[PDB]
Structures are given as C-alpha cells and as structure tokens.
Amino acid sequence: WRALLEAEKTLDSGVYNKHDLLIVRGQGARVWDAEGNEYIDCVGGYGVANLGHGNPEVVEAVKRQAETLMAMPQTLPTPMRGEFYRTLTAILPPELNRVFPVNSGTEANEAALKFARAHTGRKKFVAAMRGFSGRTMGSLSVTWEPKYREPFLPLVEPVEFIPYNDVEALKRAVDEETAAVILEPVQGEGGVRPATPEFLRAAREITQEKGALLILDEIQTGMGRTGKRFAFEHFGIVPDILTLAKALGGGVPLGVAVMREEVARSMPKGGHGTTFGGNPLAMAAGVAAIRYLERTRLWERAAELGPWFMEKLRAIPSPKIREVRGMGLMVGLELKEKAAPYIARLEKEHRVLALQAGPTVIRFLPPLVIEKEDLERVVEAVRAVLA
Amino acid sequence: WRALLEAEKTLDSGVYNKHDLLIVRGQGARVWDAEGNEYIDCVGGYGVANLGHGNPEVVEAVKRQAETLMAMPQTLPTPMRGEFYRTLTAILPPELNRVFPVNSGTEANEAALKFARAHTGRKKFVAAMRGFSGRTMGSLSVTWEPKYREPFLPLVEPVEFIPYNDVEALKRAVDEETAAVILEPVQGEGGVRPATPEFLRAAREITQEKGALLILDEIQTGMGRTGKRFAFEHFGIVPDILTLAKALGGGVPLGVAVMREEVARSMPKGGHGTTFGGNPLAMAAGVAAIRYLERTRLWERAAELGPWFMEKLRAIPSPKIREVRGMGLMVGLELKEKAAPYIARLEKEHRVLALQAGPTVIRFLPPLVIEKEDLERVVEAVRAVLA
Ligand SMILES: *Cc1c(COP(=O)(O)O)cnc(C)c1O
Numbered sequence: 001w002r003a004l005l006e007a008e009k010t011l012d013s014g015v016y017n018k019h020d021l022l023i024v025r026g027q028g029a030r031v032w033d034a035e036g037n038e039y040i041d042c043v044g045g046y047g048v049a050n051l052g053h054g055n056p057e058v059v060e061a062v063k064r065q066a067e068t069l070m071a072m073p074q075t076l077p078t079p080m081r082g083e084f085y086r087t088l089t090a091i092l093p094p095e096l097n098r099v100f101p102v103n104s105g106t107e108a109n110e111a112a113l114k115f116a117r118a119h120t121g122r123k124k125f126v127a128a129m130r131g132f133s134g135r136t137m138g139s140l141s142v143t144w145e146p147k148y149r150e151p152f153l154p155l156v157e158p159v160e161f162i163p164y165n166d167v168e169a170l171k172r173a174v175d176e177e178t179a180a181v182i183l184e185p186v187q188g189e190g191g192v193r194p195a196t197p198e199f200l201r202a203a204r205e206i207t208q209e210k211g212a213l214l215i216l217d218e219i220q221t222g223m224g225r226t227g228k229r230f231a232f233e234h235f236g237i238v239p240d241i242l243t244l245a246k247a248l249g250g251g252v253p254l255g256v257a258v259m260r261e262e263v264a265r266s267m268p269k270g271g272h273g274t275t276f277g278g279n280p281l282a283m284a285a286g287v288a289a290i291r292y293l294e295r296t297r298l299w300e301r302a303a304e305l306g307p308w309f310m311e312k313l314r315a316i317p318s319p320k321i322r323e324v325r326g327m328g329l330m331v332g333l334e335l336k337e338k339a340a341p342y343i344a345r346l347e348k349e350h351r352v353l354a355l356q357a358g359p360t361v362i363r364f365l366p367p368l369v370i371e372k373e374d375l376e377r378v379v380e381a382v383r384a385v386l387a
Numbered sequence: 388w389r390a391l392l393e394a395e396k397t398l399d400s401g402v403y404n405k406h407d408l409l410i411v412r413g414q415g416a417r418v419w420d421a422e423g424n425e426y427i428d429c430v431g432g433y434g435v436a437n438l439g440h441g442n443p444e445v446v447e448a449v450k451r452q453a454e455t456l457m458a459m460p461q462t463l464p465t466p467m468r469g470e471f472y473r474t475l476t477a478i479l480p481p482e483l484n485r486v487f488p489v490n491s492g493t494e495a496n497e498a499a500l501k502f503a504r505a506h507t508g509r510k511k512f513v514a515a516m517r518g519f520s521g522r523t524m525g526s527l528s529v530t531w532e533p534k535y536r537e538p539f540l541p542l543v544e545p546v547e548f549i550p551y552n553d554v555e556a557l558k559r560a561v562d563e564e565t566a567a568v569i570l571e572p573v574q575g576e577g578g579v580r581p582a583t584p585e586f587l588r589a590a591r592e593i594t595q596e597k598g599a600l601l602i603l604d605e606i607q608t609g610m611g612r613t614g615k616r617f618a619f620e621h622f623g624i625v626p627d628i629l630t631l632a633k634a635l636g637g638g639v640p641l642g643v644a645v646m647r648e649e650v651a652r653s654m655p656k657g658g659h660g661t662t663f664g665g666n667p668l669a670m671a672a673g674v675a676a677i678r679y680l681e682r683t684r685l686w687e688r689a690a691e692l693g694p695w696f697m698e699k700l701r702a703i704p705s706p707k708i709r710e711v712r713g714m715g716l717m718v719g720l721e722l723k724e725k726a727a728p729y730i731a732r733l734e735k736e737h738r739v740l741a742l743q744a745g746p747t748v749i750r751f752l753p754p755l756v757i758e759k760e761d762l763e764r765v766v767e768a769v770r771a772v773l774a
C-alpha cells in the first residue's frame with residue numbers, strides 16, 4: 001500500500017496538504033486505512049457523506065444504473081433524468097421547479113450566476129465577506145478569501161462584497177444594476193457562521209424590490225446537514241436560484257441549480273450546457289440519495305444530535321475553548337489558539353478525522369448517520385488532545 | 388416511460404433542445420428507446436462513450452468501488468487515486484507527470500488557466516476562433532462562439548483570439564504578457580477541424596520562446612478518439628498542461644489537468660481545489676478505462692476505420708456535400724446547407740443518432756468499438772437522407 005501512497009504524493013499537483021495515511025474503505029461514519037486502523041470520520045468528504053459511506057440504497061442504484069446506461073447527453077431524454085427532476089423538485093418549495101444539473105458545487109454556482117445575468121440583463125454580483133462559492137473563475141469572483149483570488153486576478157467583474165449579516169450594508173449594495181446576491185445560509189469555509197433570520201429576510205426583500213435575484217448556496221447546508229432538509233426552511237425564505245452539490249448524489253459527483261420558472265425561461269436556447277451534467281448514473285444516484293433522505297427524515301437526526309454534540313463540546317473543561325457554534329451537524333469548535341496541532345493529534349492519536357474552518361476552528365461534518373457513541377468518543381478525544 | 392419523458396421536458400431549465408424520444412439503455416455502439424427501437428449511436432454522450440456503452444471492465448470497476456468507498460477528499464490519500472495518477476502518467480510523455488483531477492472538461496480547463504496564471508505571473512490568454520473550452524466563466528472567456536458569451540459579459544480578461552491554423556497570427560498574438568495559449572488539436576464544436584502540424588509546432592515553439600505555457604485541450608480528442616492515444620502524439624509536441632475529460636472515466640464524471648512539474652509547484656498550497664475532484668469512484672473508473680484502452684490499443688480501431696469511413700462519406704454522390712474531414716473517429720461532414728434537418732431525418736428515418744459541429748456540419752463521435760458494418764449502415768443512412 002505504501003507504493004500507492006507514494007504514487008499519490010509524488011504525482012499529485014501538490015496543492016493539497018496530504019495526511020500521512022491511506023484510507024481504503026468506508027461504512028457509515030467510519031473508515032479504515034490500509035493497515036486496518038478504524039477512524040471516526042468527521043470530514044466525510046467535506047460534507048459529501050451525509051447519508052453515510054457506502055449507503056446501501058445509493059450503492060445499489062449506482063450498480064444497477066452502471067450496467068444499464070452511463071453516457072447520454074441532455075439533448076437525448078433518459079428516464080433517470082426525468083425521475084431526478086421530479087424527485088428533486090418534490091422536496092422543494094413550489095416556486096423552485098426548473099432544474100439545471102451539473103457535476104460540482106462550483107459548477108452549480110457558475111450556472112446560477114449565468115442564469116442570473118441572462119435573466120436580469122445586469123452584470124453586478126453582491127456576495128458576503130468570508131463567503132465561499134467555488135474555485136472556477138466565475139464562482140471564485142464572488143468568493144472572498146483573498147489568498148484564493150489574488151493569484152488569479154482579474155476575475156469576473158463587477159463584484160461587491162458586504163459584511164455577512166450586515167443588513168444595512170446589504171441594503172445599500174443592492175440596486176437596479178445588481179444581477180444577483182449570492183449567500184450561504186451558514187458560512188462553511190468562512191468558519192461555520194450561521195446567518196441571522198433578519199439578514200436572509202432582508203436579502204429576500206431587497207432583491208425582490210430591486211429586481212435582483214437571490215441565490216442561496218446550500219451546497220454544504222443542504223441535504224439535512226443543519227437539522228432541516230434545507231437551511232432556508234429554517235429561515236422562512238425561498239430563493240430565486242438554489243444551488244446544491246456535495247451530498248446531493250450520495251457521493252457520486254452531482255450538483256444542481258434549481259430555479260424559478262421565469263428565471264429559466266430567460267435563458268436562450270444553447271445558452272449554457274455541460275457534457276456530464278444530467279448523466280444517468282448521477283441522476284440515478286441523486287434519486288436514491290433523496291429517496292433515502294426523505295424516508296429516514298435524516299435531518300431530524302442532525303437536529304437532535306447536533307445540539308447534543310455541541311453542548312458536550314462546550315462542557316469540556318478546557319480553558320482553550322473559545323466557542324462552539326453551527327447548526328445541526330455542521331459544527332465549528334473555535335479555540336483560543338491554532339487548531340492545526342490538535343486536528344493532527346486527533347487523527348494520529350485518536351483516529352478521529354476532522355477539518356478546519358480558519359486557523360482557530362475545528363470543523364466537524366460527520367455523516368448524519370453517525371452513532372451517538374461515536375460522537376461521544378469525538379468529545380472525549382477533543383478533551384484529551386486539549387489537555 | 389411517457390411520464391418520465393414529459394417530466395424531463397417540463398422540469399428542465401429549457402436551455403436544451405431535447406429530442407422527442409427516451410433512451411433507456413445502451414450496449415456497445417447501440418442504444419434503445421422506451422419503445423424498443425434500436426439506434427446506432429454516433430453521439431455517444433458527445434464523445435464520452437469511447438469504450439462503448441456498458442463496457443464490462445468499467446462497469447465492474449464502478450460496482451466494486453461503489454461498495455468500497457466513494458467520498459474521500461484530496462487531503463486524505465486513497466489507493467485508487469494513486470493508482471489513477473500512475474496509470475494515467477504512465478501513458479503520457481515523462482514531462483506530464485503531475486495530476487489535478489476534476490469532474491468535467493470545463494473544470495479541467497479552469498484549472499489549466501489558473502495554474503498558468505500562478506506559474507507565469509501573467510494574465511493574458513490566447514485562444515483560437517471557433518475554439519471551445521467550456522461553459523463555466525473562466526473557460527467561457529477563452530471560448531469563441533458569440534451566442535455562448537453575449538448574455539454573460541463581461542467575462543475574464545484579457546483574452547486575444549486568433550484564427551485557427553494561422554501561424555502568423557499566432558506569432559503576432561503570443562507575447563511576454565501571455566500566460567498561456569489554449570488550443571484543441573482538432574476543434575470539436577468548431578466544426579471538426581484538425582490543426583496543421585505547422586500550426587501546433589508553431590504554438591509549441593512560440594510559447595516557449597515567449598515564456599508562455601501551452602495548454603492542449605484533448606477533452607474530446609483524447610482517449611484514442613483520433614487514432615492515437617492522444618492527438619498530440621500525431622503532431623510530435625508535448626504541451627505544458629494537458630486537459631482531459633469526457634471518455635477519461637468511461638462515463639463516470641471525470642476530468643483532469645496533467646502538467647509539467649515546474650508548473651504544478653508554482654501553485655500555492657490551497658491555491659486551488661475541488662470537493663469531488665479525485666474521488667475514489669471516478670479514480671477507479673478512470674483506471675479501468677485506461678487499462679482497457681491500453682490492453683486493446685483501442686485507438687488503432689479509430690486509426691483504421693476512420694479514414695475508411697471518411698472516404699465512404701466523401702464518396703456519397705450528393706452535391707450538398709462540401710467536404711469530409713476529421714481524424715480517427717472524430718468526423719465532420721460539412722454540407723453546403725443546414726445540417727439540422729438531415730440529423731433529424733437520420734434519427735426518425737434510420738435510427739441513427741448524430742451531432743452538429745456548427746450549423747452546416749454533421750459530426751460523428753461513435754464509440755471506438757463500433758462495428759464496421761454499423762458505420763456502413765451510417766454511410767447509407769446519410770446517403771438516403773441527402774438524396
Ligand atoms: C464545497 C462548497 C462549494 C464548492 O463545491 P465544489 O463541489 O468543491 O466545487 C461551494 N459552496 C459551498 C458553500 C461549499 O460548501
């Protein structure tokens with residue numbers, strides 16, 4: 001196995017800081033390395049494994065579709081695509097009834113930004129500081145992180161950033177020249193920072209009043225992650241374009257921009273496209289993922305375990321803890337010091353995999369099927385490494 | 388099946404020109420609609436189905452990996468990723484030894500454009516008129532088709548377009564401020580126009596003289612499509628960044644930017660990324676696709692059947708034919724009038740599925756495993772509809 005680890009490390013582009021291990025298999029919220037060590041996975045593909053590694057229903061759907069048909073373009077109708085379309089719109093508000101399937105979160109946001117420009121005839125985009133929308137140039141234009149943009153300037157213009165949750169700033173930024181406002185209901189990469197009900201309500205109101213579109217990015221908050229199927233359900237608003245990805249296909253690369261009928265209608269024929277977008281394999285996986293989410297009402301699990309887990313983390317008697325925040329099982333543990341060393345020790349000494357969300361934050365994105373006993377071990381492991 | 392067909396038509400964003408049938412399954416170069424009618428597929432997912440629909444090896448790899456692990460990020464090594472890296476670089480020139488896996492062709496080119504800017508510290512991109520690089524905003528900036536860009540301006544600047552195969556124009560355009568030149572060895576959507584050896588040699592020579600990178604987009608030409616493993620093998624040049632997708636994963640969404648090590652190391656840690664990029668499912672599919680390609684030296688079927696197929700098409704006794712061009716099984720039949728009506732007749736009257744490559748060109752991208760007898764049936768169908 002060392003040979004394969006070496007091959008990956010040596011031949012990789014090198015932009016990633018790869019950990020010293022080789023993960024070979026996963027089941028539920030657990031994964032094993034090449035040496036047989038078992039880990040509690042709170043990384044879960046960065047929020048992709050919501051339904052658990054190797055979800056039986058998704059695996060079965062993938063196997064059966066793989067034997068049937070994998071390559072069929074959007075110009076040629078295929079049953080699993082129609083099924084995905086009705087299955088996805090069925091779990092959304094009546095207004096979000098037109099689907100543009102893609103292969104990633106950044107592609108979903110790129111689609112949203114393009115549909116917004118075609119519909120409004122405007123150019124300006126308004127995003128939030130610390131907001132993250134993707135790495136391709138369009139999505140990157142509305143992504144805040146300076147280090148993520150600077151090396152690649154100039155990007156798509158014009159874009160204006162406002163402080164997250166700053167209602168007055170948002171009010172002054174949105175005008176008759178604004179094509180769209182793009183926001184995450186809970187900033188992920190930004191440090192696990194939930195939006196206030198007043199901020200999203202204001203975003204919905206101001207966009208409608210000025211003729212701009214509201215794009216809500218639920219690529220990370222969607223699919224039950226925050227305690228509801230979608231975070232917007234918790235805030236009581238319905239966007240003009242909803243972007244989804246990560247857990248949408250239960251692990252299979254899949255994303256989507258779901259929009260209102262009038263928005264979709266404005267797009268010229270042939271105005272946008274994607275080779276893999278809407279492919280039958282991903283459609284079959286998406287249908288299975290959504291059907292599983294619905295049947296199990298898995299979001300209720302995150303709504304219960306989330307608060308419990310966060311309360312346990314807050315109760316850890318460590319003077320190194322600054323705050324525990326988030327929604328459902330989208331959790332952030334902020335320390336009064338650098339988190340990197342503790343994340344490494346969690347992996348190396350406790351076999352608990354976790355992420356970061358800023359230099360002082362430990363982020364947890366465990367599959368929503370994670371057992372309470374495993375979350376207990378995570379709390380104990382965090383306490384141990386902080387001692 | 389009617390309900391699923393109508394659900395797809397109605398719930399779709401509407402940007403696609405969807406045909407009036409439902410394709411439910413495929414095997415080899417044949418596909419079936421919901422009524423049991425069998426078609427010869429020269430669309431093949433727009434060049435994705437190179438190894439044939441339901442390729443046994445890819446299907447088995449997909450099924451087995453699906454049961455094992457699907458979601459694992461780039462920060463956590465996983466064996467299939469290392470295997471994909473060494474398997475892919477093993478079939479490429481030694482210079483192309485660093486891989487950045489992605490989920491689509493446009494993502495591959497977005498990565499190429501970003502790595503180019505980071506490496507050179509320059510901004511300008513040079514592309515060819517009629518060139519197609521993708522629909523996300525970065526790739527769209529270097530894509531020519533006005534209908535694809537107009538509703539979304541402004542895009543990423545600065546970009547200068549030159550006529551394809553115009554050596555002198557290329558020499559005038561590439562300068563000390565040029566980060567990269569991006570070209571297809573054979574323009575796909577552009578009308579199936581092969582580059583001349585002179586043009587590509589010039590691109591390679593001028594970019595190195597001026598300090599710019601050469602990005603060769605083989606998303607459509609790669610994986611044996613033109614008679615060789617990769618089209619650049621025909622022209623005797625090696626690019627700085629090679630972009631691949633479509634058939635790379637045998638149908639599973641997969642793309643990649645393969646580059647020289649000096650280019651890869653220039654990218655700052657965290658300077659680029661992707662959630663699904665490099666996932667074990669796509670890596671397993673890619674390994675299997677490449678292994679099958681290598682075992683069967685599949686490009687050889689395209690090398691033998693392509694010239695023959697083009698010769699037969701060219702011999703069709705119709706004054707409506709202007710020229711037949713292409714390389715391997717990437718073929719374009721240019722007519723003196725619109726191709727759309729004939730493509731429709733091919734489908735309805737002969738159960739032959741084909742594409743366009745500009746309004747007057749009928750493009751054929753059949754799986755490379757297609758039977759000679761079926762290509763013969765295609766030639767006869769074209770003759771019939773043109774009569
Ligand atoms: C992960 C993420 C993205 C980017 O999605 P990719 O699939 O990595 O391109 C965009 N927005 C949010 C909120 C995300 O969490």
Ligand SMILES: *Cc1c(COP(=O)(O)O)cnc(C)c1O
Nearest residue numbers: 274275491492493520521606607
């Ligand atoms: C199909 C294609 C692309 C775009 O790839 P997607 O997977 O549709 O994003 C880019 N370049 C070329 C030459 C292509 O044929």
